[PDB]
Tab-separated table of C-alpha atoms in Angstrom:
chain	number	residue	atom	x	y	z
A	1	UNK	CA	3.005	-12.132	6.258
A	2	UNK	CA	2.103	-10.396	2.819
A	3	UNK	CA	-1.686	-10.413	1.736
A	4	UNK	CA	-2.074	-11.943	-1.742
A	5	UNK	CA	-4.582	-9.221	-2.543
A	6	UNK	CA	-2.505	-6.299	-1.646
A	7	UNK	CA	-0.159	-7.029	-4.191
A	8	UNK	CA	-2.968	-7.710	-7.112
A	9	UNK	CA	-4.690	-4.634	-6.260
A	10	UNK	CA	-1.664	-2.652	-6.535
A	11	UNK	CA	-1.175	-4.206	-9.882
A	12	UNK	CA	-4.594	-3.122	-11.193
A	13	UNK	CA	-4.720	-0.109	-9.182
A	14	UNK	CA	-7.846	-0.839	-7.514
A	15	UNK	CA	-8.696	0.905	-4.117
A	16	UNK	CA	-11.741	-0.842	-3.638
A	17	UNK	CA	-9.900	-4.141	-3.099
A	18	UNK	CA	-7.023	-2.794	-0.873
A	19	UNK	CA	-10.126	-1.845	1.447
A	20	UNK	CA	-10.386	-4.745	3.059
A	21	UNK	CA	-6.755	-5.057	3.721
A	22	UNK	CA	-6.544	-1.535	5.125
A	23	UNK	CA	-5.856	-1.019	9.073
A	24	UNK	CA	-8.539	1.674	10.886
A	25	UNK	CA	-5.351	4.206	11.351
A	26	UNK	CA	-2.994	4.733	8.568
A	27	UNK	CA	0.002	6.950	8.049
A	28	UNK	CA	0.098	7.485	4.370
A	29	UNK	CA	3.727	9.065	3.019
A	30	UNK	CA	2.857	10.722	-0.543
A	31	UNK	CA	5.615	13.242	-1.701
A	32	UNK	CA	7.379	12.852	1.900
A	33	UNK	CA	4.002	14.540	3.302
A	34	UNK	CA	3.488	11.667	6.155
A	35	UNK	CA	-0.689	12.235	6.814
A	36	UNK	CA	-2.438	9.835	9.349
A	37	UNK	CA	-5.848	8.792	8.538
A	38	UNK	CA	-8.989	7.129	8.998
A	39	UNK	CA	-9.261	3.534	6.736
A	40	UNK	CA	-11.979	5.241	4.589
A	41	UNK	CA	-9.915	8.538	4.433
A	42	UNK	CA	-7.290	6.073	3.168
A	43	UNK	CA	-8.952	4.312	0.631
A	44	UNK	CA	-10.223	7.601	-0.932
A	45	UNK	CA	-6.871	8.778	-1.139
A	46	UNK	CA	-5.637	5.881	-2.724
A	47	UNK	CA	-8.606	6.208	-5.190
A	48	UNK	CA	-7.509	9.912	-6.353
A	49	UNK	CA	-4.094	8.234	-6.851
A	50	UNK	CA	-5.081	5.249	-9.005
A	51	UNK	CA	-7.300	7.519	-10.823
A	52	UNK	CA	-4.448	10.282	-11.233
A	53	UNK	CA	-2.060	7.679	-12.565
A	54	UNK	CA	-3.425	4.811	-14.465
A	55	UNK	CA	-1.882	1.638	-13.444
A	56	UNK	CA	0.042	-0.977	-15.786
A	57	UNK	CA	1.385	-3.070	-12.776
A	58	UNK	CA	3.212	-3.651	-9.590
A	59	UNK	CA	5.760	-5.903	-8.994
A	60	UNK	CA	7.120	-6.729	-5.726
A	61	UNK	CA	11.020	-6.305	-5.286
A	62	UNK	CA	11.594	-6.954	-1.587
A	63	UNK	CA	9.774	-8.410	1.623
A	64	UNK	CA	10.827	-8.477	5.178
A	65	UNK	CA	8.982	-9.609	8.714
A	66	UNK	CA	9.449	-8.188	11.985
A	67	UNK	CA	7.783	-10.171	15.027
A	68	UNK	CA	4.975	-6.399	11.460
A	69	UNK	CA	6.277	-6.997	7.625
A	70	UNK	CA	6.724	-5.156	4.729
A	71	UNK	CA	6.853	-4.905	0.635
A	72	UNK	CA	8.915	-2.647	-1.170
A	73	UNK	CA	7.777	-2.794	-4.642
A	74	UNK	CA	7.716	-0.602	-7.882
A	75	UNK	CA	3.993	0.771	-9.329
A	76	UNK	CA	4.390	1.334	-13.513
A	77	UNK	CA	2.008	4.040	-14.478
A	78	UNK	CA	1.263	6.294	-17.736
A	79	UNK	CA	2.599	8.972	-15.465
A	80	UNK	CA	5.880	6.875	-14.832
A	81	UNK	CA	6.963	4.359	-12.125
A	82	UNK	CA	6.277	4.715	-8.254
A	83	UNK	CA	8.054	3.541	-5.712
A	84	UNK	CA	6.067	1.938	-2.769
A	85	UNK	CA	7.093	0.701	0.507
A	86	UNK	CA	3.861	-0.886	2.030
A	87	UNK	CA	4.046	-1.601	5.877
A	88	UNK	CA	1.659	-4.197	7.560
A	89	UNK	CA	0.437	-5.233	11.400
A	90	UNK	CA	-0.724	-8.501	12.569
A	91	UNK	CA	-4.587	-7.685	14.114
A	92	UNK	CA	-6.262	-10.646	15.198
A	93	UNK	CA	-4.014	-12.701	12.811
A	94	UNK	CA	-4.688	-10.839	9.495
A	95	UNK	CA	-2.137	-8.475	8.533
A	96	UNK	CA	-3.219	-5.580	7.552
A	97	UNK	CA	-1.951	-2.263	6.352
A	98	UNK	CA	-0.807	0.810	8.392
A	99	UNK	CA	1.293	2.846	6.974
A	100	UNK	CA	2.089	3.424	2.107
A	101	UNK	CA	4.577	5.462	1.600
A	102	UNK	CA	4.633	6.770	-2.018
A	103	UNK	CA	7.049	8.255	-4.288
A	104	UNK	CA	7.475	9.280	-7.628
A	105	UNK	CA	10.963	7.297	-9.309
């Protein structure tokens, strides 16, 4: 229901490694701009916004499953904290990601 290595890439703030987790479509939410987006386009964007805000960690406050599941979880950076609600969709039994929303707490 909730990749493993979602939740340690968020805490290092490494793109590279949510890659594999990404869906090929997602919505991304950053500053209530909702974008949809190729899984590359995605994992660039994510880049610019691990490299824009340097990670200290992630640490997951809620989960919930629907049939889809979700975290809600808060991202500590030298910027200040974010607040991320991460959305996910079985595909051939591997959930993976398809829509972050992102916002600045």
């Amino acid at each position: 229901d909730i990749p493993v290595g979602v939740v340690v890439a968020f805490k290092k703030g490494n793109s590279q490694e949510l890659n594999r987790y990404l869906g090929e479509k997602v919505n991304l939410v950053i500053q209530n701009r909702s974008e949809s987006v190729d899984r590359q386009a995605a994992e660039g964007t994510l880049a610019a916004f691990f490299s824009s805000n340097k990670v200290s960690g992630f640490n997951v406050n809620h989960e919930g499953k629907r049939d889809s599941s979700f975290i809600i979880g808060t991202l500590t950076t030298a910027n200040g904290n974010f607040r991320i609600n991460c959305f996910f969709r079985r595909v051939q039994n591997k959930y993976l990601i398809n829509q972050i929303r992102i916002d600045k707490t």
